[PDB]
Paper text:
ATP-sensitive potassium channels (KATP) are metabolic sensors that convert the intracellular ATP/ADP ratio to the excitability of cells. Functional KATP channels are hetero-octamers composed of four Kir6 and four SUR subunits. Kir6 are inward rectifier potassium channels that require PI(4,5)P2 for maximum activity. The SUR subunits bind to activating Mg-ADP and drugs, including insulin secretagogues and KATP openers.
Based on these observations, we made H175K mutation on the SUR1-Kir6.2 fusion constructs, in which the C terminus of SUR1 is covalently linked to the N terminus of Kir6.2 by a long linker to ensure the correct 4:4 stoichiometry between Kir6.2 and SUR126, yielding the H175Kcryo-EM construct. Subsequent refinement resolved two 3D classes: one class has a closed and the other has a widened inner helix gate. In contrast, in the structure with widened gate, the inner part of the M2 helix moves outward. Particularly, the side chains of L164 and F168 move away from the center, resulting in the dilation of the pore. The radius of the ion permeation pathway at the bundle crossing of TMD now increases to 3 Å. However, the constriction at the cytosolic G-loop gate still shows a radius of 2.6 Å. While in the pre-open state, the side chains of F60 swing away, which allows the expansion of M2. In contrast, there is no ADP density in the pre-open state, and we observed an obvious structural reorganization around the nucleotide-binding pocket of Kir6.2. During channel opening, there is a 6° anti-clockwise rotation of CTD viewing from the intracellular side, resulting in the clash between E51 and the nucleotide-binding pocket in the pre-open state. Although the ion permeation pathway of the pre-open state does not allow the permeation of fully hydrated potassium ions, the hallmarks of KATP channel activation, such as the enlargement of inner helix gate of Kir6.2, the dissociation of inhibitory nucleotide from Kir6.2, the rotation of Kir6.2 CTD, and the binding of activator NN414 and activatory Mg-nucleotides on NBD-dimerized SUR1, all suggest the current pre-open structure represents the “activated” state of KATP.
Numbering used by the authors:
A (entry chain B): 2 to 275, 281 to 329, 337 to 621
B (entry chain A), D (entry chain C): 32 to 356
C (entry chain B): 1139 to 1286
Write the structure that this text describes.
């Protein structure tokens, strides 16, 4: 009972007559060894260093620096945890065939999972405490792990397992990940020579985290706390006990300061000149902030690719609910049998959903941070134009002070929200292409008919979008005049009351508002047309596919797996089309804002 | 307001923003001794249990490598006899390290690696035994518990002895056993500001105890009244009975540093007095009286004081009135 | 916002009703998540209400700093106070930007928590539906309904 | 220039040309305790391993002398049962000395020399156990590691307190646990020459700490500013801010001698200040502030000083200017 290898053929798996390394159970125990070594080294060191804190003495590192390969190490650790979860699942699936329970299939992988979690906790505590000489133990562990896994892989090569078996692929992936983490440790030794080899290099912590008193720790936290926003937690706690003020919020980091983004935008404009206009402003914004926009678009692209793991998992799960090789004395599970399953697909769907949501929130945060830096740079440039402006611009009716203040209060906000919405527009066509390809893979020619039904209303969609853009241009044009007339009525209200001219100027503001409401009525009519079109396109497409899949074509049965996976794919593909009116409104408000910003920046100045 | 030292001797100062962590990593023994009792019990259990488990895994892997776990065939000398599973290796590791040695499971001469692992396990077990038993005995023999039986009066007193307006206390010992070379260190903690402009938030200025030899040594068989004469050099030279309320900066701490006679380890007993706990015009009652054949100390009257006619002027004003007369 | 809110708040209740129909045991696990959500809405809403207000009260001295700069432009440039007022703008812009950044990161904190709860909803519903279809027959079509 | 004491307390003095070696031969225990950790681990392993090997050779020679190693004949009582080779004697010596006693190999009553060797091995094993475990525990419980958690400010300061131009420091404790009867010994090390012509290369003249009672005792809950008033009796009476560069003979060392409360073993923490590390016209900032319900010590500002208007005259010239006014 509870033997490490099951008591089959009178415990023939414990015989080492052929070879000590030619026994899978012994190689599994050798794989158990480095995880036990890492736990037994790390637990007293972690308990002494960070568990000896008391209520009277609290030890806090207000400043920290990151080791080289930090992002790579956290990514490799996450991939290691994923592959070890898959190895636990494969070992449980392989052990379920046999009558006795073979503990060597899943207990080494569970011990490895615990060791990987313990190693990343050890690395984070070391990194936030800056003790590079304590990384040696991690180095030893990775070396030991790599060696043991290499032995397993080599023995799997000697018995000719092959790539049809999933445990061979997981063993090779584990060898690759352990070697990559060993190379990361060697890179840490090379860049920072903490070991007894010449003079070590002190990176020194960044100055904004050092003594600037910043409390926005998002550039300075690790990828787990950068993606889950864990550092915010204390703020969310302290807002219960004390109200959040401008002292609890610190100072801006140097990369996020208004002067830094303003100088970056000035460098972009100078690179353009070596002036103004809307197109040059757009290219200057591209040169200054498009790298961060590409980073947010990459996170959104990865989230879109992992969003298709939903419908594919539904396909596999429902297909299994609608319904082998002995090797070295232990049953193996192929990749088709592993990915077939049902609970394995649920676990993979859960992990893919977690990764997709983390990537999507990272994309949203990077886009909004880029928009806020853009707002700071644009406000600084507007004010620098104001300090170099001529009063003859305001004195001859070319511009009014309300319009100059609305360049900050309104137009910069519109450009900022369009910079929020930019990565979704950049990453939409990749999602559309992969969704149509997966629809064809699940359905076939019926999905081509449904995609043709979607495509056949694209000229109507473009016509509605152009009409919406014209209506919103008219709305902005009338709203600026209405705000100007309302401002001049409110500032001179006493004269209007004394002369009894309040109703006349109110009627003029009503006339301008009536023109604005005509433009808004046109926008709302075409918005209702767009919403009805983008909500009847999925219904008509789903109906035409699921009628043509049985009445017209006889290639395959309908089945719940194909139908519900295609339903999920159709819903995912038509979800970005729901917000077409908001997208075109934000885009045309950005275009108007950039155009009048270019008109203001190319105005008259005071000669030296 | 915050209290620097509690009446039971607990120091309320919180240490924060400690950037240097490697001082604690170099000092492992002091981290191990100063843990709480459940934490030291947990570490004492876990160190022995982990050593048994680790060497058990080594013994099990050795018996696996020799084919001892396989029940097939026979008449082969194992590395360790009667090792059949992980439980057998765990029991054998316990028998080796605690040196019980039942001998149903016994090392043999066939495997030299078994002999090497036996040597390594014995050396590691001796080291763990020495360190852990010494840690537990040093924690039990700590001198913090002896300071619990040292008591101080709850209210400090200010009265007139030989016309000098002394600040009096009362210490006491609840133990038959003595305290060797007992010394008394009294300090006054405030927020004194220098004339140049330096503000020290917890400025501790020590006050002399009137010993009689100009030293700190006391003899603590019976409860003693410990009096600091408030003179021109005293920090309390301008202290008034119009002071001594709760919202007053004054604190006075008394430290009894001694050696426990029975263990030889030095102990420290602390007790602080706030301003509202210093009574003006009061005096400690006598508590020691001659018994049937010896002296008896009435500890029920230990904190008892009585009203005594004392001038309400400060020591400055009392000295000026003495100089005028 | 009204159209988006109607679509979201009705697809949520429709989906919870559908999963409750195909798997009633999900209702047993519907209660703790609704507890957890509540605690998250307990902790976020106090913070966000501060961070919104602090974002608004930092926007007023920024915008007003433009309003006095344009009307007093001759006066500021006559005193040669252009650099001082540009430095004042840098201070105001930094205050407003970091208030907006803390509001943004608080929103991302809340959305990470809520989306992880949604992933837990998918995992729990999948476990219940798959265990049913292997134990108590669901015709293998209601499972696709519940997962979708 | 050379440093007498490092900032971490390491004393850089090298002892050479020691003709007397028999002092070290008489003092074996201090040589054994003061070895490095790999050397003490090596000696701890080698003493037990050599005792096991030596008594193993004795047991093997006894079993050879009795004919127990010969497999010929039978029904003869051996001195020790199941002794067949040197490995059997080594395992049996390990079983005897560590008192495991598996009992597959067991002393018999046939040979009295086996009983005598068993007695001698048990006595030698008890002695080696006592000496080695006590050495390892005394090395682990050493008070040098406690001095790591005692910190000193990196820069000494000279400012004006009550118009006396004091030399100030800052000590600090990173531990919750107290230090019992803590004393401060400050010295000034130079190359002072007597008027007769005697040159002392490392002349240490101690300077008094302004305690308030004329003693050395301090209380170390919170970080303290330790100030020596530079008066006419001070060695720094002629010290100038035109001095205090790197190529200056002045060194000032501070020694914190205490008793660890948790172990009872006295500890010594040292920190020296060169001339360039003494700042003129600077003052330590306050780091202790009232927390939510207690006092909090900001250790991030521990070494922080600020510029303070201080006279650039020496204490001689300041005293002469005071006497002129
Ligand atoms: C919300 C979900 N159900 C759904 N989405 S849909 O693609 O809008 C569409 S169209 C049509 Cl006909 C029937 C359906 N059913 C579950 C995805």
């Amino acid at each position: 009972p509870l033997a490490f290898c099951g008591t089959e053929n009178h415990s023939a798996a414990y015989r080492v007559d052929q070879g000590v390394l030619n026994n899978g159970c012994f190689v599994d125990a050798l794989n158990v060894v480095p995880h036990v070594f890492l736990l037994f080294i790390t637990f007293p060191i972690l308990f002494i260093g960070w568990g000896s804190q008391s209520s009277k003495v609290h030890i806090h590192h207000s400043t920290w620096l990151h080791f080289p390969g930090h992002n790579l190490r956290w990514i490799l650790t996450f991939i290691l945890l994923f592959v070890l979860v898959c190895e636990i699942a494969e070992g449980i699936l392989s052990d379920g065939v046999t009558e006795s329970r073979h503990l060597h299939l899943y207990m080494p992988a569970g011990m490895a999972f615990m060791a990987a979690i313990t190693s990343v906790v050890y690395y984070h505590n070391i990194e936030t405490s800056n003790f590079p000489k304590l990384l040696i133990a991690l180095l030893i562990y990775w070396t030991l792990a790599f060696i043991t896994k290499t032995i397993k892989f080599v023995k799997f090569y000697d018995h000719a397992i092959g790539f049809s078996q999933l445990r061979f692929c997981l063993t090779g992936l584990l060898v690759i990940l352990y070697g990559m983490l060993l190379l990361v440790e060697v890179n840490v030794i090379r860049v920072r020579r903490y070991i007894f080899f010449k003079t070590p290099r002190e990176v020194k912590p960044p100055e904004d985290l050092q003594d600037l008193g910043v409390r926005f720790l998002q550039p300075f936290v690790n990828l787990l706390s950068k993606g889950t926003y864990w550092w915010m937690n204390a703020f969310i706690k302290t807002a219960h006990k004390k109200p959040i003020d401008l002292r609890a919020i610190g100072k801006l980091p140097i990369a996020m300061r208004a002067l830094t983004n303003y100088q970056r935008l000035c460098v972009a404009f100078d690179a353009q000149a070596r002036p103004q206009g809307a197109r040059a402003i757009w290219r200057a914004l591209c040169h200054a902030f498009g790298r961060r926009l590409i980073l947010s678009s990459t996170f959104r692209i990865l989230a879109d690719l992992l969003g298709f793991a939903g419908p594919l998992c539904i396909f596999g799960i429902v297909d299994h609910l609608g319904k082998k090789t002995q090797f070295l004395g232990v049953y193996f599970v192929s990749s088709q049998e592993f990915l077939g399953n049902a609970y394995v697909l649920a676990v993979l769907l859960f992990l893919a959903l977690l990764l997709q949501r983390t990537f999507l929130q990272a994309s949203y945060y990077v886009a909004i941070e880029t928009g806020i830096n853009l707002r700071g740079a644009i406000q600084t440039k507007i004010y620098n134009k104001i300090m170099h402006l001529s009063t003859s611009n305001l004195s001859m009716g070319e511009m009014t002070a309300g319009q100059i203040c609305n360049l900050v209060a309104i137009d910069t906000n519109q450009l900022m929200w369009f910079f929020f919405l930019c990565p979704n527009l950049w990453a939409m066509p990749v999602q559309i292409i992969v969704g149509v390809i997966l629809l064809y893979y699940i359905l076939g020619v019926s999905a081509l008919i449904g995609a043709a039904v979607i495509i056949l209303l694209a000229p109507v969609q473009y016509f509605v979008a152009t009409k919406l853009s014209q209506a919103q241009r008219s709305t902005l044009e009338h709203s600026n005049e209405r705000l100007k007339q309302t401002n001049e009525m409110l500032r001179g209200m006493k004269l209007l009351k004394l002369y009894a001219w309040e109703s006349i100027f109110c009627s003029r503001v009503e006339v301008t508002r009536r023109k604005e409401m005509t433009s808004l009525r046109a926008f709302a009519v075409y918005t209702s047309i767009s919403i009805f079109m983008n909500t009847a396109i999925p219904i008509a497409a789903v109906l035409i596919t699921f009628v043509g899949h049985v009445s017209f074509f006889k290639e395959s049965d309908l089945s719940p797996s194909v139908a519900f996976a295609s339903l999920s794919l159709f819903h995912i593909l038509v979800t970005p089309l729901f917000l077409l009116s908001s997208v075109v409104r934000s885009t045309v408000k950005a275009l108007v804002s950039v155009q009048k910003l270019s008109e203001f920046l190319s105005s008259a100045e005071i000669r030296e | 307001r915050a209290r620097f030292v509690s009446k039971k001797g607990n120091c309320n100062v919180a240490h924060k923003n400690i950037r240097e962590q490697g001082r604690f990593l170099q000092d492992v023994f002091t981290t191990l001794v100063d843990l709480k009792w459940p934490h030291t019990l947990l570490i004492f259990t876990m160190s022995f249990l982990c050593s048994w488990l680790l060497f058990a895994m080594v013994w099990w892997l050795i018996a696996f490598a020799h084919g001892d776990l396989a029940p097939g065939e026979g008449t082969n000398v194992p590395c360790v006899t009667s090792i059949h599973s992980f439980s057998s290796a765990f029991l054998f590791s316990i028998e080796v390290q605690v040196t019980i040695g039942f001998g149903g499971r016994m090392v043999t001469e066939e495997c030299p690696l078994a002999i090497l692992i036996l040597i390594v396990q014995n050396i590691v077990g001796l080291m763990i035994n020495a360190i852990m038993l010494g840690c537990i005995f040093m924690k039990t023999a700590q001198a913090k518990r002896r300071a619990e039986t040292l008591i101080f009066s709850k209210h400090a007193v200010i009265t007139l002895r030989h016309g000098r307006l002394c600040f009096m206390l009362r210490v006491g010992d609840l133990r038959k056993s003595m305290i060797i070379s007992a010394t008394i260190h009294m300090q006054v903690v405030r927020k004194t500001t220098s004339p140049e402009g330096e503000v020290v938030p917890l400025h501790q200025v020590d006050i002399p105890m009137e010993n009689g030899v100009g030293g700190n040594g006391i003899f603590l068989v019976a409860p003693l009244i410990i009096y600091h004469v408030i003179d021109s050099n005293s920090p309390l030279y301008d202290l008034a009975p119009s002071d001594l309320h709760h919202h007053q900066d004054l604190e006075i701490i008394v430290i009894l540093e001694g050696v426990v006679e029975t263990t030889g380890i030095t102990t420290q007993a602390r007790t602080s007095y706030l301003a509202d706990e210093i009574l003006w015009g009061q005096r400690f009652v006598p508590i020691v009286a001659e018994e049937d054949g010896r002296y008896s100390v009435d500890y029920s009257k230990f904190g008892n004081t009585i009203k005594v006619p004392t001038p309400l002027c400060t020591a400055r004003q009392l000295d000026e009135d003495r100089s005028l007369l | 916002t009204l159209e988006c809110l109607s679509r979201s708040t009705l697809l949520c209740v429709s989906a919870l009703t559908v999963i409750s129909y195909v798997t009633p045991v999900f209702l047993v696990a519907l209660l703790p998540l609704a507890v957890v959500c509540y605690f998250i809405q307990k902790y976020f809403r106090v913070a966000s209400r501060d961070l919104q207000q602090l974002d608004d009260t930092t926007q007023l001295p920024l915008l007003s700093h433009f309003a006095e700069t344009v009307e007093g432009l001759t006066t500021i440039r006559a005193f040669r106070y252009e650099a001082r007022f540009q430095q004042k703008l840098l201070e105001y812009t930094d205050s407003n930007n970091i208030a907006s950044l803390f509001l943004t990161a608080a929103n991302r904190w809340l959305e990470v928590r809520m989306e992880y709860i949604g992933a837990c909803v998918v995992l729990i519903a999948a476990a219940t539906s798959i265990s049913n279809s292997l134990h108590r027959e669901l015709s293998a079509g209601l499972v696709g309904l519940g997962l979708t």
